[PDB]
């Protein structure tokens, strides 16, 4: 596996790093950047030789969306939850139907949007980018997911929050509200998004240090990393703040022998 | 002078949605679409209560 | 700025009252049966065509 | 002593009970037996000691002892420099006159002239007014019952003189009767030209009782309320008091931010004073709270050691603001960081800050971090009639507050883009307010 | 006939004589594609007819007659505005986002202040050609005015570029020649 002890060493090093200190009233976005964890994976041929806008949802022990939301109440940008559903789906599903299910576990859908609404109400780059930039959590039906990228705009596919997440209301022939109900729970608190770019570089976003426990950070990182090792042949792992330099934790030197 | 059945039913919906408080039901969008006056709400609810439901 | 400091009326923001009075007029006419519902009218026409 | 000990009519007793007053402040406890005795007086007291109520009680005693009709006279006349202080004195006086039978009114330059004219045609048994508009109403309004003058008061003759209404005051007193009139006046300090008006006014011989960096944030006038909202969200769980000018904007901003569900306490002259006391008590004991208030309602009461002084609106007295930040620093061992919003027309205020010689810190603004709720604001104002009217009222009273401002060299209405001001209030088109421009 | 003789002798005696510059702002009007897209815009915002109105009324009234009080929800009606005093009424707030003005009205003096009035109020007016084409989009015989205020979010971006299009095509092209005395050349 991976020496958890070394991960605790590195995260305490990063806590000490971010603990190092006419000023702004409203704080710098860069100041918010220099507090956040990003996982970086060197791995052989992370392309599928093709663009992959589909996000892999990794099973994670802890859920950073709740400390996200709790700090987002204090923060300027407010955490919002977007679902994009079919026309008949929105005709059937109502909002209190969602809200009653989500107050059970204490979360909230902000909005639900049809593809019609994407293709006529926000068929304008300014309004569409402004509407997308409000949101952190974007969900979409798996049927609509492969219809999205003409409607969403590539500016939505640039960032990690702005790109949508595959989610399914169906389990049988028709959809069930139970499936969407527990499925938003699965995608919310038990899974984390993964962009899949080209090259040998993978960037995985974890989150601000102030949100979670550092050993809980270590547990989530080691779980994700074992999931990645079992997934892909991996050259190396550097985790860091996007202001900070890298931190080498784990690497496999024989992967590069096995490529060719 | 009694009350009409639709609007007393409307008041009955408001009485169960908010209860008795008026600042919440004043800023209610659904079932206060005419945006009734703060105290007209009180007057109609007191007339409705004296009519029915104490 | 505009010329006049005329206060905005209430009825510009809420659903239209006079509409609703005409609605209740039609409701009273249908309760008296002087106006037939259009679904019932199409039901009448479908039988009367045969 | 106590207010409830002294000889009073029972509706005044009910009034004082409902305003929460039982005890007396010492200088007002001194001046009240001459206030009942019928002598003229001048007085040095701090702004906001309750010195409004100090004259309010025996004035209503005189109106109770005379029992005259609304057609019969005006009697009690109140001269006060600031429109804001006029509204505060009026809002305190409303419930007092409300348990009484007589009549209460407003004369303010910047109000609708046919409104004030029709109220004068009906007659008003207690007048509260600004000095400039009084010459207009005395010279121009016909049939107005002027000949009585049971009494008259001046408040803060320093501020009348510092504005410069004293020649208007001389013309007023030359219009005023003297023999029925008694004159009472409050001014914390005094000068010679104050005493010259005092020698004309006070009909008997009177006995009188005498007892650091700043933040500055230059913002455009549209985005300043948005930036206030953003900074208030970022500094949530920190108690902060915001200083305003107009009570309508206080009530409107409080209702708005409560509609955006972040917890906000309001504090203004239209607020009932027992409720006002409740809000101040809850702010002082809650210690992490948002307090919205005017300048002079904040002046009227001592301030807990705060995380931030934020001043959104232009000041009533900038000199008192310079003394107030100094006494705030020297009184509060806990650090209270003071800031004022600025508009790019207002930078001359800065050099008057450079006249104050206290240091200054510019606090910068990122255009990226903008809360972007202004579309939701405009959709809300197009939705809610009630919020639409309160927004228009905050806008109206804001512009009339600029109209009532003294320092024209710091504030010109001609400088201001009212389109951006309306967009800050949330109107795409500025509503018409009948303001001389 | 007489009336054919007069209607041919009309527009001769006009152009033969000097027209004042507050007239002949008319027929300096909008070109082909821009008026076409303006009509494509306003046909999206047709007002409800009396038949469609009465039909929806009968639907909701039969609903309440069953009762079957379905919900209490409707956003707003959006439509063009077409009453002349109502069009002027939507100015001096201002509320008019676009105004179309017919060139041909037989009492021209009903209309002549409207370009200067939207000029001073800053309202994006445009002079359209033919009040019958206004009446068609508003279910009247003629309309002679066409104000439009409220627009859905789907159409708001089209609105702004149409405004910029008109201010480029009308306010830039014809502004100086608006000041000039038209006509005067004999027939």
From Swiss-Prot, chain A:
GO terms for molecular function: identical protein binding; large ribosomal subunit rRNA binding; proteasome binding; protein-macromolecule adaptor activity; ribosomal large subunit binding; RNA binding; rRNA binding. The keyword Nucleus applies. It is found in: Nucleus, Nucleolus. Its main location: nucleus. Keywords: Nucleus, Proteasome, Ribosome biogenesis. Coiled coil: none annotated. This is Proteasome-interacting protein CIC1. Interacts with CDC4, PRE4, PRE6, RPT1 and SCL1 as part of the fully assembled 26S proteasome. Interacts with pre-ribosomal particles constituent NOP7. GO terms for biological process: maturation of 5.8S rRNA from tricistronic rRNA transcript (SSU-rRNA, 5.8S rRNA, LSU-rRNA); maturation of LSU-rRNA from tricistronic rRNA transcript (SSU-rRNA, 5.8S rRNA, LSU-rRNA); protein catabolic process; ribosomal large subunit biogenesis; rRNA processing. Transmembrane segments: none annotated. GO terms for cellular component: nucleolus; preribosome, large subunit precursor; proteasome complex. Present with 45900 molecules/cell in log phase SD medium. An adapter protein that specifically links the 26S proteasome to its substrate CDC4 which is one of the substrate recognition subunits of the SCF E3 ubiquitin ligase complex. Required for turnover of cell cycle regulatory proteins CDC4 and GRR1. Required for synthesis and nuclear export of 60S ribosomal subunits. Required for vegetative growth.
From Swiss-Prot, chain B:
Present with 2860 molecules/cell in log phase SD medium. It is found in: Nucleus, Nucleolus. Belongs to the NOP16 family. Component of the pre-66S ribosomal particle. Interacts with NOP7, RRP1 and RRP15. Signal peptide: none annotated. This is Nucleolar protein 16. It comes from the Eukaryota. Involved in the biogenesis of the 60S ribosomal subunit. The modification Phosphoserine is found at residues 2, 4.
UniProtKB/Swiss-Prot annotation, chain D:
One of its GO terms (molecular function) is ATP binding. A motif (Bipartite nuclear localization signal) lies at residues 223-239. This is ATP-dependent RNA helicase HAS1. GO terms for biological process: maturation of LSU-rRNA from tricistronic rRNA transcript (SSU-rRNA, 5.8S rRNA, LSU-rRNA); maturation of SSU-rRNA; maturation of SSU-rRNA from tricistronic rRNA transcript (SSU-rRNA, 5.8S rRNA, LSU-rRNA); ribosomal large subunit biogenesis; ribosomal small subunit biogenesis; rRNA processing; snoRNA release from pre-rRNA. A motif (Q motif) lies at residues 1-29. Its main location: nucleus. A motif (DEAD box) lies at residues 155-158. Interacts with RRP1. Associates in the nucleolus with the 60S and pre-60S ribosomal subunits. It has also been isolated with the nuclear pore complex. PROSITE patterns: DEAD_ATP_HELICASE (PS00039), HELICASE_ATP_BIND_1 (PS51192), HELICASE_CTER (PS51194), Q_MOTIF (PS51195). The keyword Nucleus applies. Transcription depends partially on SET1. Phosphorylated by CDK1. Optimum pH is 6.5. Active from pH 5 to 8. Residues 32-208 form the Helicase ATP-binding domain. Keywords: ATP-binding, Helicase, Hydrolase, Nucleotide-binding, Nucleus, Phosphoprotein, Ribosome biogenesis, RNA-binding, rRNA processing.
Swiss-Prot record, chain E:
One of its GO terms (cellular component) is cytosol. GO terms for biological process: cytoplasmic translation; maturation of LSU-rRNA. It comes from the Eukaryota. It is found in: Cytoplasm. Belongs to the eukaryotic ribosomal protein eL8 family. Component of the ribosome, a large ribonucleoprotein complex responsible for the synthesis of proteins in the cell. The small ribosomal subunit (SSU) binds messenger RNAs (mRNAs) and translates the encoded message by selecting cognate aminoacyl-transfer RNA (tRNA) molecules. The large subunit (LSU) contains the ribosomal catalytic site termed the peptidyl transferase center (PTC), which catalyzes the formation of peptide bonds, thereby polymerizing the amino acids delivered by tRNAs into a polypeptide chain. This is Large ribosomal subunit protein eL8A. It comes from Saccharomyces cerevisiae (strain ATCC 204508 / S288c). The lineage of its organism: Eukaryota, Fungi, Dikarya, Ascomycota, Saccharomycotina. The gene is RPL8A. The chain holds residues 53 to 239 of 256 of the full protein.
């Amino acid at each position: 596996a991976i020496p958890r002890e070394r991960v605790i060493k590195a995260v305490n090093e990063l806590i000490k790093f971010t603990s190092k200190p006419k000023n702004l009233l409203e704080d710098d976005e860069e100041e918010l950047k220099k507090d956040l964890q990003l996982i970086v994976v060197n791995n052989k041929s992370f392309t599928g030789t093709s663009k992959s806008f589909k996000l892999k949802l990794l099973n994670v022990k802890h859920s950073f969306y709740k400390p996200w939301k709790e700090a987002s109440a204090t923060a300027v940008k407010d955490f919002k939850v977007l679902l994009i559903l079919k026309d008949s789906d929105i005709k059937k599903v109502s909002e209190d139907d969602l809200f009653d299910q989500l107050d059970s576990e204490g979360i909230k859908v902000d909005e639900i949007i049809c593809g019609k609404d994407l293709k006529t109400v926000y068929k304008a780059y300014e309004a569409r980018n402004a509407f997308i930039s409000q949101f952190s959590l974007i969900l979409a039906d798996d049927s609509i997911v492969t219809s999205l990228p003409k409607l969403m705009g590539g500016k939505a596919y640039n960032k990690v929050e702005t790109t949508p997440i595959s989610i399914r209301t169906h389990a049988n022939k028709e959809f069930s509200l139970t499936t969407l109900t527990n499925n938003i729970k699965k995608v919310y608190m038990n899974q984390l998004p993964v962009k899949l770019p080209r090259g040998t570089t993978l960037n995985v976003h974890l989150g601000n240090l102030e949100w979670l426990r550092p050993e809980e950070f270590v547990d989530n990182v080691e779980l994700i990393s074992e999931q990645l090792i079992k997934a892909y042949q991996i050259r190396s792992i550097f985790i860091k703040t996007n202001r900070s330099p890298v931190l080498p934790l784990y690497y496999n030197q024989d992967v590069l022998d096995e490529l060719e | 002078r009694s009350q009409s059945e639709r609007e007393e039913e409307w008041l009955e919906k408001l009485y169960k949605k908010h209860g008795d408080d008026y600042k919440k039901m004043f800023f209610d969008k659904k079932l206060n679409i005419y945006q009734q006056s703060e105290g007209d709400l009180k007057r109609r609810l007191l007339r409705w209560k004296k009519r029915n439901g104490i | 700025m505009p010329l006049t400091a005329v206060p905005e009326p209430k009825r510009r923001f809420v659903p239209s009252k006079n509409e609703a009075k005409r609605v209740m007029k039609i409701v009273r006419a249908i309760r008296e049966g002087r106006i037939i519902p259009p679904k019932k009218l199409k039901e009448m026409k479908x039988x009367x065509x045969x | 002593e106590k207010f409830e000990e002294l000889k009073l009519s029972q509706p005044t007793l009910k009034a004082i009970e409902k305003m929460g007053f039982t005890t007396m402040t010492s200088v007002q406890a001194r001046t009240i037996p001459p206030l009942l005795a019928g002598r003229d007086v001048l007085g040095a007291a701090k702004t906001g000691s309750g010195k409004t109520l100090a004259f309010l009680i025996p004035a209503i005693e005189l109106l109770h002892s005379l029992k005259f009709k609304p057609r019969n006279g005006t009697g009690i006349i109140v001269i006060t420099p600031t429109r804001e202080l006029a509204l505060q004195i009026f809002g305190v006086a409303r419930e007092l006159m409300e348990f009484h039978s007589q009549t209460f009114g407003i004369v303010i330059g910047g109000a609708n002239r046919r409104q004030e004219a029709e109220k004068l045609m009906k007659g008003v048994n207690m007048l509260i007014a600004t000095p400039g508009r009084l010459l207009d109403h005395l010279q121009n309004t016909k049939g107005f019952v002027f000949k009585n003058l049971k009494a008259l008061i001046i408040d803060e003759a320093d501020r009348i003189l510092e504005i410069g209404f004293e020649d208007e005051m001389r013309q007023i007193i030359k219009i005023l009767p003297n023999e029925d009139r008694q004159s009472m006046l409050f001014s914390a300090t005094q000068t010679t030209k104050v005493e010259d008006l005092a020698r004309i006014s006070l009909r008997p011989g009177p006995l009188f009782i005498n007892v650091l960096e700043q933040g500055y944030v230059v913002c455009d006038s549209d985005k300043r309320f948005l930036l206030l909202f953003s900074f208030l969200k970022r500094n949530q769980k920190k108690k902060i008091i915001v200083f305003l000018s107009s009570c309508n904007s206080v009530k409107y901003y409080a209702e708005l931010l409560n509609y955006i569900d972040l917890p906000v306490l309001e504090l203004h002259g239209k607020q009932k004073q027992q409720k006002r006391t409740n809000t101040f008590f809850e702010f002082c004991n809650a210690e992490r709270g948002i307090l919205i208030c005017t300048d002079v309602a904040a002046r009227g009461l001592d301030i807990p050691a705060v995380d931030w002084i934020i001043q959104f609106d232009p000041p009533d007295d900038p000199r008192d603001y310079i003394h107030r930040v100094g006494r705030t620093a020297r009184g509060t061992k806990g650090k209270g960081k003071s800031l004022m919003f600025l508009t790019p027309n207002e930078l001359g205020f800065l050099r008057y800050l450079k006249a104050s010689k206290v240091p200054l810190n510019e606090y910068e603004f990122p255009e990226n971090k903008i809360a972007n709720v202004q579309s939701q604001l405009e959709k809300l104002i197009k939705s809610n009639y009630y919020l639409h009217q309160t927004a228009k009222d905050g806008y109206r009273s804001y512009l009339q507050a600029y109209a009532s401002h003294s320092l024209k060299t710091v504030y010109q209405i001609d400088k201001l883009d009212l389109a951006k001001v309306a967009k800050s209030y949330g109107f795409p088109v500025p509503p018409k307010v009948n303001i001389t421009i | 006939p007489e009336y054919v003789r007069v209607q041919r002798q009309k527009k001769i005696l006009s152009i033969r004589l000097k027209v004042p510059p507050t007239i002949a702002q008319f027929q300096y009007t909008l070109d082909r594609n821009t008026a076409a897209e303006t009509f494509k815009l306003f046909n999206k915002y047709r007002p409800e007819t009396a038949a469609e109105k009465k039909e929806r009324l009968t639907k909701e009234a039969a609903a309440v007659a069953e009762g079957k009080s379905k919900q209490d929800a409707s956003p707003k009606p959006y439509a063009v505005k077409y009453g002349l005093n109502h069009v002027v009424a939507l100015i001096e707030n201002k509320k008019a986002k676009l105004v179309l003005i017919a060139n041909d009205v037989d009492p021209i003096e009903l209309v002549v202040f409207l370009p200067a009035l939207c000029k001073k109020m800053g309202v994006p007016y445009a002079i359209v050609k033919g009040k019958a084409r206004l009446g068609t989009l508003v279910n009247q015989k003629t309309s002679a005015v066409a104000a439009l205020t409220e627009v859905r979010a789907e159409d708001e971006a089209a609105l702004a570029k149409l405004v910029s299009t008109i201010d480029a095509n009308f306010a830039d092209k014809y502004d100086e020649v608006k000041k000039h005395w038209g006509g005067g050349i004999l027939g």
